[PDB]
């Protein structure tokens, strides 16, 4: 460690003083060490470029060796699934990372133009297995090749969508007329019968046993739009959650004081209130 | 604050009392440093320089990164209040008042005409239930467009278009403190220019190597 | 409301424009946004839905647990490919990408099996005026309510 101090003090600032560019830009007095450092940079660039080239190429060769009801119906079914998933007007793009260093825009991901405009009903239920499907179809009185090829083609599209997500970047866009309408609809129009029955009810049924939950899971479930309310204690060192479904509904989460806590409490859109204790409880203590 | 908490402050020799008959070399400066006949001065790492100076420990904090409150004195380091037992609302609100609710997640996302329209105008008009005067709206829009000058110039100087050093000096002229930390602006222009030319010729010779490496197995 | 500055009013705009980067010598825009706008657009709580909700859940738990224990065991030893943007409304998902971009970690709360978790899931008045003048309290250096004064007086007693 004794030499490293002097190495910091008098070698690397003197190095950058020799690497100062008042002498470098003049090619007529390039020192031998100057062109030596130039050649070092050239060799490092060549080695890095060849290594990243072979490292990118090798798994592609690996998958090449491993590899070696209209399509409009597929497009409409993917459109229906995406309309089931996310709300209208939010268009989300998969902008693909090319190996060279450029950004390729494919135009076939369903996250873009899904919003753009007796056997069909049953066949659109992929959340349920085909076993119970055929069991309840025999209870109806109504083709195995079509279901087989539905399965095959969904496997194909699953594999392709898995492969496309290895290295990609994503772009959202909202529908500001629709989004502002949603703000008028759900921020001004949220008129639940539960206006203020949260903190008082906890102050009454304090005798309940609310089990403990961590901070990060509280965040991970608060973000999810799974929780009905958030309750602040008057010392801001405990927080009694009150979600919509679960056993139990309410818990105890101990809390670190950081702003991003309050930011996600906001962006989740949950019911925010603080229990007010009286003025004797800090004199009883 | 004099080391920002990093602690690795830069050092510099400001003046040198050279003997009559010598040249300003580097070894003579080091010999003067041995006998302390040169003015050793501390430059913050907050200032970023073209030549990285020796970064050693900050003497104002002894490497910890903090200054103790010297305004507090030993005779009055204790209080008499039993405030520590009953955890107050005001201490929590005060310790949370220096958390700033960092707004950077919207300021960067704010640079869109429709999105700025929404956030600046539409949300207060809907939530508050009021309506702005035209003077208020126009002053908001003017101050916004006036504030967008720096990001427009940053985007334009990020193109690497020919003659970008003029827009670089424009960026360093319009606002000093922000331009002192922008990573797009390069401190030494000939440095970057000749390194770019050298990298071009380096990828040329890399292509030479990668193309004559495929002519020996046949 | 001082805890969560997005109100779910004009101070938000002021902090958006003016506070963001010496004197800066301009508080007039705050008041201009304040008064340059004119508004133009049952104290009885009900615990009934609260009680009926836990009634519903305690009803549903029995059947859900029967199906669950019929399915799962624990042994002693598509949608959006961005998790926050699912079952979130338009205005809730609006600012969601704004927080996703700067902070990327969801903490992805999924993993269980460490040494601590060997279990595994299996799915199937002369001087009075001079006294008034004399008092040197011009340095305040206080930086609440008189009720706090009362409670602190009681604490001191």
């Amino acid at each position: 460690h004794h030499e490293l101090t002097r190495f910091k003090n008098e070698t690397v600032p003197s190095f950058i003083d020799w690497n100062k560019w008042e002498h470098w830009k003049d090619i007529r007095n390039w020192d031998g060490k100057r062109v030596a450092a130039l050649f070092i940079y050239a060799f490092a660039l060549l080695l890095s470029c060849q290594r990243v080239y072979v490292a990118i190429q090798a798994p592609r060769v690996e998958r090449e060796r491993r590899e070696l009801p209209s399509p409009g119906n597929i497009e409409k079914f993917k459109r229906n699934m995406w309309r089931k998933a996310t709300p209208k007007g939010l268009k989300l793009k998969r902008f693909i990372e090319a190996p060279d260093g450029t950004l390729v825009h494919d135009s076939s991901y369903v996250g873009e133009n899904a919003w753009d405009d007796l056997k069909k009903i049953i066949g659109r239920n992929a959340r349920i297995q085909t076993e119970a499907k055929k069991k309840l179809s025999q209870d109806l009185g109504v083709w195995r090749e079509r279901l087989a090829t539905w399965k095959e083609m969904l496997e194909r599209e699953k594999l392709s969508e898995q492969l496309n997500s290895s290295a990609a970047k994503y772009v959202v866009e909202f529908d500001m007329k629709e989004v502002e309408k949603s703000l008028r609809e759900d921020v001004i129009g949220r008129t639940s019968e539960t206006e203020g029955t949260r903190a008082l009810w906890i102050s009454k049924r304090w005798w309940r046993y609310r089990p403990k939950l961590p901070y990060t899971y509280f965040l991970q479930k608060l973000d999810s739009s799974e929780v009905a309310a958030v309750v602040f204690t008057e010392d801001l060192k405990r927080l009694y959650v009150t979600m919509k479904e679960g056993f139990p509904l309410e818990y105890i989460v101990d809390i670190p004081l950081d702003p991003y806590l309050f930011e996600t409490i906001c962006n989740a859109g949950v019911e925010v209130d603080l229990l007010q204790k009286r003025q004797i409880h800090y004199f009883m203590k | 604050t004099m080391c920002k908490g990093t602690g690795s402050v830069h050092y510099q020799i400001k003046d040198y009392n050279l003997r009559s008959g010598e040249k300003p070399t580097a070894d003579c400066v080091a010999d003067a440093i041995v006998e302390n006949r040169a003015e050793l001065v501390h430059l913050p790492s907050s200032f970023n320089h073209s030549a990285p100076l020796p970064s050693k420990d900050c003497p104002t904090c002894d490497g910890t990164g903090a200054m103790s409150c010297t305004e507090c004195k030993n005779k009055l380091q204790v209080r008499i209040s039993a405030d520590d037992i009953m955890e107050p609302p005001w201490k929590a609100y005060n310790v949370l008042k220096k958390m700033d609710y960092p707004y950077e997640h919207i300021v960067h996302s704010m640079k869109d005409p429709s999105i700025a329209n929404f956030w600046l105008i539409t949300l207060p008009q809907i939530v508050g239930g009021f309506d702005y005067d035209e003077d208020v709206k126009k002053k908001i829009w003017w101050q916004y467009e006036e504030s967008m000058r720096y990001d427009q110039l940053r985007d334009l100087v990020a193109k690497r278009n020919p003659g970008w050093e003029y827009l670089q000096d424009a960026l360093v002229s319009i606002d000093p403190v922000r331009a002192r930390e922008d990573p797009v602006i390069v401190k030494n222009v000939p440095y970057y220019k000749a390194k770019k030319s050298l990298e071009a010729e380096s990828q040329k010779k890399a292509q030479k190597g990668s193309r004559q490496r495929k002519w020996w197995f046949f | 409301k001082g805890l969560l500055p997005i109100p779910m009013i004009n101070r938000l705009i002021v902090s958006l424009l003016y506070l963001t980067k010496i004197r800066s010598f301009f508080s007039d825009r705050w008041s201009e946004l304040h008064l340059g706008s004119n508004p133009t657009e049952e104290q009885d709580v009900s615990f009934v839905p609260s009680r009926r909700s836990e009634n519903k859940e305690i009803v549903n738990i029995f059947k859900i647990i029967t199906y669950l224990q019929n399915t799962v065991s624990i042994h002693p030893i598509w949608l959006n490919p961005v998790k926050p943007f699912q079952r979130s409304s338009l205005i809730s998902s609006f600012s969601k990408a704004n927080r996703l971009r700067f902070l990327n970690n969801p903490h992805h709360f999924c993993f269980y099996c460490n040494k601590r978790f060997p279990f595994y899931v299996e799915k199937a008045l002369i001087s009075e005026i001079s006294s008034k003048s004399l008092h040197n309290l011009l340095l305040s250096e206080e930086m609440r309510s008189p009720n706090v004064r009362e409670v602190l007086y009681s604490i001191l007693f």
Binding site: Y170, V172 | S109, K111, D155 | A97, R101
Partner: peptide
């Protein structure tokens, strides 16, 4: 990667 709303990428 990350969400890259157009003001980052388009402009």
């Amino acid at each position: 990667x990350x969400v890259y709303v157009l003001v980052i990428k388009v402009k």
